[PDB]
RNA sequence: GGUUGCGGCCAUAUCUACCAGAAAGCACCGUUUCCCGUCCGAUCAACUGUAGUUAAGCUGGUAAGAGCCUGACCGAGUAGUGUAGUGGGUGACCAUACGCGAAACUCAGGUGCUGCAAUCU
RNA sequence: GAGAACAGAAAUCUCCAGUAGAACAAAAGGGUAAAAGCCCCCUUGAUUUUGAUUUUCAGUGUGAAUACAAACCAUGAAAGU
RNA sequence: AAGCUCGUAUCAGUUUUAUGAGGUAAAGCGAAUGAUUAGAGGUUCCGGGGUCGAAAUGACCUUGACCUAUUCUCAAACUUUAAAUAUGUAAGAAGUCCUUGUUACUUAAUUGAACGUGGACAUUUGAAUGAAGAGCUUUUAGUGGGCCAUUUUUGGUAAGC
């Protein structure tokens, strides 16, 4: 019927490994009250920044 | 009782077996990084005390207090625990919190809490309520409980909710037992008699208090009397003190 | 539901690495600012006039 | 402890190599204690290898 | 410290609901002079024939100097003489009459005769600390009163003897 | 230092029993016209701090008290447990080697500490 | 546990002790003491639009559940729920 | 198997330091909870079904509602206490610190929250050891009857069950 024998050495033939964290996580499932601000937020920064600062 | 049941039993908290505190109220006033500020109005015999309390895991952070002593200095000194005295105190602070902020920039809002006072139509607790909803703190509330509404309609008497600012209940019962039994007219009242203020100059004081509050809110504390240390000196001779081992051992 | 311990630990050693570099660079000398683990203790001269040690004599039963 | 043996380097039967001895490598040999021998070594030995 | 009266508790036990009920209903209200609350039995028994809920006695308590005239002019029927026992460890005390026309009234024959139960309880100035809700509290040890203070007050006024 | 309002950790703060508390603060207490709430102005509501008390509440002290909190080359390196042997025993199980290591108990001392604001010989 | 005419093991009434020894539609286990239990007061959020997520898992479906956003309402003096 | 982007990257069937999680073995019964073989009578303290019934003062039969007053012995479906082995995360560049930039979210408030410009901080850049490259992507083959030993266990007296 039913065992595991034999089943974490299959585990660790291809090691066991991370889901690699990159930078900038998907804001897709944050609240998004957060989410409609913070467009508008980048919006005005990267104008400032190559209006002024240049 | 066994001593099994001593060692089973845990205790309430500190500040709910001496029952002065409702925490299933309280953890709904705390946990709404924003300072959520809280009015906190306490009623005792003879006195009144209102205070703008912050909430912080050290403990509490105090605003701004302002008590019914403080109204001798603004023209109110008989009936310091009436609804008027109850609505000059919630002008008091009303007026007092908001100078130190600047203020006097949507509207400041402060919430109301009670504690164990229970909620009846007319009481002495909403006075405050209105006394700080007209000084400029927005303290969100409707007009179910204020004096002078009526059971049958959703009516609120603007005629008759002016009269317990000024007094009213006070000035009409003077008028009462003015014609009725001067012996217990003499009895209570009696402040009011060695003063000679009778009914109706009673409304010219509290409009004229209001208008020293709105005046004269900056609170200089009383002066003192001896010291700090001198009152503590003084304390130390009425209290005992702990007892040392070997005076217990040769007991 | 928690809060956890171990990282804000992290936080304060973070905090003196600062002030460590901060004053060696001032005084000119070594920082050694990284941990190590145990070592195995030197030699130290202990001197029985204090206290004779006494025999054992594993009997008792 | 194959896998601690693998990080001492030690792969194949008689194999040896130098370990410095703190608290952490002290728990390692602890492990495979059954598998290998250790000791403290003299100048002359490790001149000869 | 006195040992004033706090109220009196006036209860009438008729098996049945019905007119039996508020007939016996109207002696204490037109005594009392106040409307008496009625009581739902909890359970059933079938012996006594009664059945749940079924509003199977009325009671009465009176606070102050009107129940000091009703308790003189109904102990006068005891002839100034409890019994022996009759007193809680607590320090209160009850005495059942039959016979209500012995307080007086008409004999009224829509009405007619019941059988009450009068009961006393005592306390001290001071007993709001229990029955208040802020900082409640329990009352001392010298202050809760004692069964044998009742009995000297007892035998005090009134000029009764207990007995026995 | 004493009290008061609002709390933080939530018995070292509880439970039982007696005894003290200067001032002020709280509390008991007085009355029912009005808002108000009840079988009952008891609870709650409003009114005066005037008619009276520290008797309770509350605070503090006391007891080889019960409970409760830390501590111990105390129990004890004991029980148990990871690893190793072509170790012992017919077994049931027990030594040994490299390691980790309790609890009940016994004894020792302890019996609330503190945050903001206001106020008192 | 101590008391109250008829009235007792069992009606009703009164105080003291009372850490859940009760109750919460039902199995069992959790949970709960100014409540999540009891009794009153008002009510339809047992609603609309679709997404995000957890458990069973192929990280498919179905069931059940969690935290939000935009609307419209309920209740309370209010924070809220 | 075909490879592709790159080249000490950053990772690991491992240990240390720090910090969580658990209710097993051992402990406990004079701390809460505590079965078991067993059982005499108690007719509106009930009756739980059943059959009858031109009815209900309504019969007939069977578990009983109750242990009524007791006694000893417990544990996987009992607990205050709590190992060993096993197990989650952290040990810095995507970092710390300063100055101040944005917005329709937030605050009583340009206070916060998020992401930034500019400036300071270098190989001991933040524990050990190791790294015979690291990383990602397609595509398909076989397989989907397993068995044995050490130790812990459940059903079974027992077993190459």
């Given at each position: 019927?039913?065992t595991?024998?034999?089943?974490?050495?299959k585990?660790?033939?291809?090691?066991?490994?991370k889901?690699?964290?990159?930078?900038?996580?998907?804001?897709?499932?944050?609240?998004?009250?957060?989410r409609?601000?913070?467009?508008?937020?980048?919006?005005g920064?990267?104008?400032?920044?190559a209006?002024?600062?240049? | 009782?066994?001593?099994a049941?001593s060692?089973?039993?845990?205790?309430?908290?500190?500040?709910?077996?001496?029952?002065?505190?409702?925490?299933?109220?309280?953890?709904?006033?705390?946990?709404?990084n924003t300072?959520?500020?809280?009015?906190?109005?306490?009623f005792?015999?003879?006195?009144?005390?209102?205070?703008?309390?912050?909430?912080?895991?050290?403990?509490?952070?105090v605003?701004?207090?302002?008590?019914?002593?403080?109204?001798?200095?603004?023209?109110?000194?008989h009936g310091?625990?009436?609804?008027?005295?109850?609505?000059?105190?919630?002008?008091?602070?009303?007026?007092r919190?908001?100078?130190?902020?600047?203020?006097?920039?949507r509207?400041?809002?402060?919430?109301?809490?009670?504690?164990l006072?229970?909620?009846?139509?007319?009481?002495?607790?909403f006075?405050?309520?209105?006394?700080?909803?007209?000084?400029?703190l927005?303290?969100?509330?409707?007009?179910?409980?204020?004096?002078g509404?009526?059971?049958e309609?959703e009516?609120?008497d603007?005629?008759?909710?002016?009269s317990?600012?000024f007094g009213?209940?006070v000035?009409?019962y003077?008028?009462?037992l003015?014609?009725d039994d001067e012996?217990?007219?003499?009895?209570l009242?009696?402040?009011?008699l060695?003063?000679?203020?009778?009914?109706?100059?009673?409304?010219?004081?509290?409009?004229?208090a209001?208008e020293?509050?709105?005046?004269?809110?900056?609170?200089?504390?009383?002066?003192?009397?001896?010291?700090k240390?001198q009152?503590?000196?003084?304390?130390?001779?009425?209290?005992?003190?702990?007892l040392?081992?070997?005076?217990?051992?040769?007991? | 539901?928690?809060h956890?311990?171990c990282?804000?630990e992290?936080?304060?050693?973070?905090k003196?690495?600062?002030?460590?570099?901060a004053?060696?660079?001032?005084?000119?000398?070594?920082?050694?600012?990284?941990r190590?683990?145990?070592?195995?203790?030197?030699?130290?001269?202990?001197?029985?006039?204090?206290?004779?040690?006494?025999?054992?004599?594993?009997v008792?039963? | 402890p194959?896998?601690?043996?693998q990080?001492?380097?030690?792969?194949?039967?008689?194999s040896?190599?130098?370990?410095?001895?703190?608290?952490?490598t002290?728990?390692?040999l602890?492990?495979?204690?059954?598998?290998v021998?250790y000791?403290?070594?003299?100048?002359?030995?490790?001149?000869?290898? | 410290?006195?040992?004033?009266?706090?109220?009196?508790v006036?209860?009438?036990?008729?098996?049945?609901?019905?007119?039996?009920?508020?007939?016996?209903?109207?002696?204490?209200?037109?005594?009392?002079?106040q409307?008496?609350?009625?009581?739902?039995?909890?359970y059933?028994?079938?012996?006594?024939?009664?059945?749940?809920?079924?509003?199977?006695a009325?009671?009465?308590?009176?606070?102050?100097?009107?129940?000091?005239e009703?308790?003189?002019?109904?102990?006068?029927?005891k002839?100034?003489?409890?019994?022996?026992?009759?007193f809680?460890?607590?320090?209160?005390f009850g005495?059942?009459?039959?016979?209500?026309?012995?307080?007086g009234?008409?004999?009224?024959?829509?009405?007619?005769?019941?059988?009450?139960?009068?009961?006393?309880?005592?306390?001290?100035?001071?007993?709001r600390?229990?029955r208040?809700?802020?900082?409640?509290?329990?009352?001392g040890?010298?202050?809760?009163?004692?069964?044998?203070?009742?009995?000297?007050?007892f035998?005090?006024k009134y000029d009764?003897d207990?007995?026995?």
């Amino acid at each position: 019927n039913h065992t595991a024998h034999n089943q974490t050495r299959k585990a660790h033939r291809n090691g066991i490994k991370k889901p690699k964290t990159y930078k900038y996580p998907s804001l897709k499932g944050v609240d998004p009250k957060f989410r409609r601000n913070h467009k508008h937020a980048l919006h005005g920064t990267a104008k400032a920044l190559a209006a002024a600062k240049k | 009782k066994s001593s099994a049941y001593s060692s089973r039993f845990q205790t309430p908290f500190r500040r709910r077996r001496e029952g002065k505190t409702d925490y299933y109220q309280r953890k709904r006033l705390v946990t709404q990084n924003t300072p959520k500020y809280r009015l906190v109005v306490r009623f005792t015999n003879k006195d009144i005390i209102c205070q703008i309390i912050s909430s912080t895991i050290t403990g509490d952070v105090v605003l701004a207090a302002a008590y019914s002593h403080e109204l001798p200095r603004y023209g109110i000194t008989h009936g310091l625990t009436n609804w008027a005295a109850a609505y000059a105190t919630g002008l008091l602070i009303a007026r007092r919190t908001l100078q130190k902020l600047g203020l006097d920039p949507r509207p400041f809002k402060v919430f109301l809490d009670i504690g164990l006072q229970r909620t009846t139509t007319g009481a002495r607790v909403f006075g405050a309520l209105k006394g700080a909803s007209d000084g400029g703190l927005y303290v969100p509330h409707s007009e179910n409980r204020f004096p002078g509404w009526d059971f049958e309609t959703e009516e609120i008497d603007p005629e008759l909710l002016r009269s317990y600012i000024f007094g009213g209940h006070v000035s009409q019962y003077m008028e009462e037992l003015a014609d009725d039994d001067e012996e217990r007219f003499s009895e209570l009242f009696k402040g009011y008699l060695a003063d000679d203020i009778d009914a109706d100059s009673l409304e010219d004081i509290y409009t004229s208090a209001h208008e020293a509050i709105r005046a004269d809110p900056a609170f200089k504390p009383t002066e003192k009397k001896f010291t700090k240390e001198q009152y503590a000196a003084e304390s130390k001779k009425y209290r005992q003190t702990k007892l040392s081992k070997e005076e217990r051992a040769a007991r | 539901i928690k809060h956890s311990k171990c990282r804000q630990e992290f936080l304060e050693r973070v905090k003196a690495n600062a002030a460590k570099r901060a004053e060696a660079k001032a005084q000119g000398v070594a920082v050694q600012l990284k941990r190590q683990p145990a070592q195995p203790r030197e030699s130290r001269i202990v001197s029985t006039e204090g206290n004779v040690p006494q025999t054992l004599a594993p009997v008792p039963y | 402890p194959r896998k601690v043996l693998q990080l001492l380097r030690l792969t194949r039967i008689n194999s040896g190599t130098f370990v410095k001895v703190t608290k952490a490598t002290l728990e390692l040999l602890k492990l495979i204690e059954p598998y290998v021998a250790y000791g403290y070594p003299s100048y002359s030995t490790i001149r000869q290898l | 410290r006195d040992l004033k009266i706090e109220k009196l508790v006036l209860n009438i036990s008729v098996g049945e609901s019905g007119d039996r009920l508020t007939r016996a209903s109207k002696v204490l209200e037109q005594l009392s002079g106040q409307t008496p609350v009625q009581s739902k039995a909890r359970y059933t028994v079938r012996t006594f024939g009664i059945r749940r809920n079924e509003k199977i006695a009325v009671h009465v308590t009176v606070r102050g100097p009107k129940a000091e005239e009703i308790l003189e002019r109904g102990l006068k029927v005891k002839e100034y003489q409890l019994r022996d026992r009759n007193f809680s460890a607590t320090g209160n005390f009850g005495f059942g009459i039959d016979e209500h026309i012995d307080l007086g009234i008409k004999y009224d024959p829509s009405i007619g005769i019941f059988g009450m139960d009068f009961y006393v309880v005592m306390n001290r100035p001071g007993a709001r600390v229990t029955r208040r809700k802020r900082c409640k509290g329990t009352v001392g040890n010298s202050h809760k009163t004692t069964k044998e203070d009742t009995v000297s007050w007892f035998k005090q006024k009134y000029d009764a003897d207990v007995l026995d």
